Amino acid sequence: MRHDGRQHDELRPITFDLDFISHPEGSVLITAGNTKVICNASVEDRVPPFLRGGGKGWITAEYSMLSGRTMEIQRLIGRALRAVVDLEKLGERTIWIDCDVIQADGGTRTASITGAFLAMAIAIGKLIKAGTIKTNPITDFLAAISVGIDKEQGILLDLNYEEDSSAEVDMNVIMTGSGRFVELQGTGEEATFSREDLNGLLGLAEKGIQELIDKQKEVLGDSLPE
Amino acid sequence: MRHDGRQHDELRPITFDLDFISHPEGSVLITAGNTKVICNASVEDRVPPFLRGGGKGWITAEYSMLSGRTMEIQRLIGRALRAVVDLEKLGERTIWIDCDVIQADGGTRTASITGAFLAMAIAIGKLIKAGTIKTNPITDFLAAISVGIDKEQGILLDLNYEEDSSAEVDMNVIMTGSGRFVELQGTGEEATFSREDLNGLLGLAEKGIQELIDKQKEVLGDSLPE
Amino acid sequence: MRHDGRQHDELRPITFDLDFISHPEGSVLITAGNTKVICNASVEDRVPPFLRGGGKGWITAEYSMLSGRTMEIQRLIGRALRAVVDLEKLGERTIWIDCDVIQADGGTRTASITGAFLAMAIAIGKLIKAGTIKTNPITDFLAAISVGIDKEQGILLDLNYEEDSSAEVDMNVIMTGSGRFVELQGTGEEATFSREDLNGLLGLAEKGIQELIDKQKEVLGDSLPE
Amino acid sequence: MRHDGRQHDELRPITFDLDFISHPEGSVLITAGNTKVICNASVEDRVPPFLRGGGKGWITAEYSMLSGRTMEIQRLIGRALRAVVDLEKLGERTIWIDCDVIQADGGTRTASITGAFLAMAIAIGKLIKAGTIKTNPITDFLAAISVGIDKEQGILLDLNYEEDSSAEVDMNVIMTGSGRFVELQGTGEEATFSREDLNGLLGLAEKGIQELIDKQKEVLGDSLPE
Amino acid sequence: MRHDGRQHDELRPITFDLDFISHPEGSVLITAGNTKVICNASVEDRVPPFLRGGGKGWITAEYSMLSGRTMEIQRLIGRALRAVVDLEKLGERTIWIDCDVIQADGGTRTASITGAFLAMAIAIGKLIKAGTIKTNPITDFLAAISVGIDKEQGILLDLNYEEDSSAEVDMNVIMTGSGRFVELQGTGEEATFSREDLNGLLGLAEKGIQELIDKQKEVLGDSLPE
Amino acid sequence: MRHDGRQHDELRPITFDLDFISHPEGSVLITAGNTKVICNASVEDRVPPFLRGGGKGWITAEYSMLSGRTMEIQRLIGRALRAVVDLEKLGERTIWIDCDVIQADGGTRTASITGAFLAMAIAIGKLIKAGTIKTNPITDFLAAISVGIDKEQGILLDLNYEEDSSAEVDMNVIMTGSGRFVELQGTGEEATFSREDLNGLLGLAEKGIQELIDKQKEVLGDSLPE
């Protein structure tokens, strides 16, 4: 069995603490096992040099943990969010995403994305309500998860810190409620994986991500129409 | 048809200029269309802090173009190469990989990997010959390619700079002669892709990478036994 | 009256959430009004170059907010904590203090100190229990608070972000349960203060800090003997 | 007695070398014992982003010794000077303060403030004379000194490098001719001090600072009216 | 005799590979012995903050090898090129110079300058042809070389890596076809040199640089009128 | 005539204030016109990683003004000093050179070298006296000066800030009492110079540097035997 004590295709206990802190337009504390990431979203009526006069908004993120990969992850989060947001319907604005990991135990980057979406959704929901936009930008839900293969354990879903360290092959996936991929990244550490292995991993990813999005729905609910 | 003038599943003209420069143990100038990357490999009887006394060698790479992603790519190349090299059979050494892009036109990172392998193979082949190791470390050939989807063009193989810029979904794959994956990374820019799309992309990747490895064989030939 | 709605010599609602996160030996989430700072404490059987072989432990802190003053505050926290800890009774160790401000609304640095102590006390209490030291290092409780003078409001205690921004004179104090000072810093922004003013400020500081230490006692309780 | 050979409430030999260097509008070389700090003041008809169009001037300082605390001290000097200068009467200008310690032997930061004032006064006096402002900005004299407590020596005034290193409690004070505080900072190193101790220290500070200001007056004299 | 096998006043085999890569307006691969530097030149209708509205163009370079001296060399190349180019006749543009050393064996910085000129000349020649300027900016040819003194070997010209490492005095010179100096830098490593020594070195420099410029002429030829 | 009011081959009024500050083993305040640089030298019985166990000493310098060129100049000063000091006769030590420009008016880097030598000589002289070495390391005097060419003024010696800014060609020279060069650097700003020009400049340099060394001798005198 698994060290965590769960099954191959089982996710860690997940909880969403909405409105963690009052300041941000959207604040969410996502918890997955022992992993805890605070995700805040703030809206700013302004736009970087890239645009300004273009009419379409923007979404940028910031990430920190308990700088090389920090920059990477940082682009990953902003890239994923813009994948489900019609920047033009959002208007000329900038949704600042802040992901602060307060407890790392594996899957911190994938969680950040899952939590960041909710935060963003809550912030956008309030904008819609305040009639500051009158039009829903979010085109689909978004969630991410991690999968991997262990020599003795086999294929796993939602790896913790230890399992990821022993895994010979790990992969991070990002999809939409529509079951469409936004981004995926598989890697083998001193080991390779067949196409049949990848098929199993992608299968587990879809399962885990669909469960996360479902939870995103029951929790979000009234704070956003779609 | 394609702007380059080729087919959907067609690779750009590929050439391997062995022994580009004399100094390195292995020097290769890989050309893919207008993309040109010089790949050099040097062996050093030494090992970073990581090991030294462990008995198994190491492989590290350096990348430069005409620093955030530079660091990433840099780890990507070293990661991929170590995937097909038995560090213990290589002995306590350090194979320095130098990838210098002298002309970028798409697929520079995937090419670097394809060219870096050859350079490394030539350098290792000479080590074997000089009896400095008497045992082939390389366990399998290695090549990488890029694929993508265009709105009007559809699924493509070996994207150039323009096609990659217009592609809504791009992915980089890395496999072994054995047809096994070493690493893959798919991304969607303001667009998502179904599972059936990914299946087509992975299909084109395998096709392109198998053609590259074949070329690696006819060119390498006598400079390495396996 | 005060904007916050409270009195001149009144502290903001204060709460101590013990064991905020499981990983750290001591985790505390201190809340003062809208200010929220997560304070974690971890013990490491090691010592910086300074000592190592000296026999007496060490205490170093880290601070972050939503770098010039960050370094300052950072030394401030470590300086204050070492003021109430017999490093030799602590043994050759290093108590890492982590202060992460998740919501800033004035008095974040003084709070960090108040919260950091509790975290440290809980971590040390567990060390004593595990018999890893068998001797209480903490020689006295420690708490900090901020005071200031406003043109129209007058002398204030525990300033929030707005009151501190309008204050012409602000000061941070740090004392021990014994009612002894550990450190104080008064400053006047385009304004000066008499000696009689300073006497009033120091008076309010002692009042506020004594209330904080009292709360530290009812909360800490069984987790540390003294 | 004291190592320096002086009394508890005795200042080190103090001298003010006016017009140390010709370039600056105001150049002063302050000497306190073995401590030597060159204080230069220059006026610039310009203003940082902060203002520009506001009508009130500014005062910024720079500090260097034979960067963490450098930044701190740097703000300390500018903060103290602006405390005795009516920025609006100064006009839209920027008084650059340059404090270069050429010989450190304790009390270099407090001296810098004492010497910086004179430099500034001389520079402002010339501005008044040149009718470039016709209105005295300086509202009061300014001087700073350091005090401390030693285990065997007791309470001290104007500590040198050795006395400060052995002192268990040290404090820096800054006041105006009016006998009003501008800023104070007391700290205890592995030791605390009662309120009665602080009263004695503040007493010694006022004594030392009043003697410094007096010297500032006999030296400044004709170079500034007030 | 010399280790390389050549004479005191003899240059290493020099070759100029024009149009090394297609992308740049001017691409040149200069070879001196085992030293190989790729020099590319690109024109941009834009100008840094320095000018823009001034009417005169600019020339900036970039250098890399297999950062302290990198910055230096970088300014050296741009400085030398602007010495022979009438920025106003060039028009409001920016000629980007890219020097990439693919094989270092001494005299890489001096070569870069020699090769950079050719690249720049070819790029400018095309601009003239395209009538985008109709007026030759280049006022004179430019070439650089290195000289040095060895304890046992004596005065040398065009030092390789080994000779430069053993040389007690090395110097880099830069001149124009007109035989005028653009820049020179002589240094003695744990050794000094008389004025008579410097006279001999400058003599050898002029000889070597005149041979280089001559080669620049036979190669450049039809690609630029003057 | 010259703006400063002096001749073409005339140096600015030069003064050497020995023992500027007491702390350093050797302290010198060199003045050249309005240029003022404090040069201090301290000896440390220790050696960087470079050596330690090698037996020969070291000399490193630090430079600051009222970081790119700072690093350069910094190496320039240390390079020049080691040129006239037998590191082995100095013993395993490290002579720290501190150059602080308190007033810049041209020729600050060349002055630093001239003043740094004296400081070093005084510090070494005391070491010899204290019998801590019993053997003179300094093998020759050292001085530096700057020369340049102006369009209307012509060839100049010891340029001030204004003359250097208008000069189309400026050069810094460094020689020994023996009349031998240690280092020279000539540069042309939007202008070039013939060989006959360089001959005139080198002529003026030797004149100025020989006058400086002479002054170094009458001032140094009894504080060092040679």
Helix share bin of chain A: 25-40%
Largest interface (CB < 8 Å): C-D, 30 and 30 residues
Compute the number of structural domains of chain A: 1
Can you identify the CATH superfamily of chain A? GHMP Kinase, N-terminal domain
User: Number of DSSP strands of chain A?
Assistant: 9
CATH class of chain A: Alpha Beta
Radius of gyration of chain A, whole Å: 17 Å
- Indicate the multimeric state: homohexamer
Task: Trace the largest sheet of chain A across and list its strands.
Answer: 1-2-3-5-4
CATH architecture of chain A: 2-Layer Sandwich
Supply the helix-strand structural class of chain A: alpha+beta
Distance between the termini of chain A: 40 Å
Enzyme class (chains A, B, C, D, E, F): transferase
Family (chains A, B, C, D, E, F): Belongs to the RNase PH family.
Organism (chains A, B, C, D, E, F): Bacillus subtilis (strain 168)
Binding site for phosphate (chains A, B, C, D, E, F): 69, 107-109
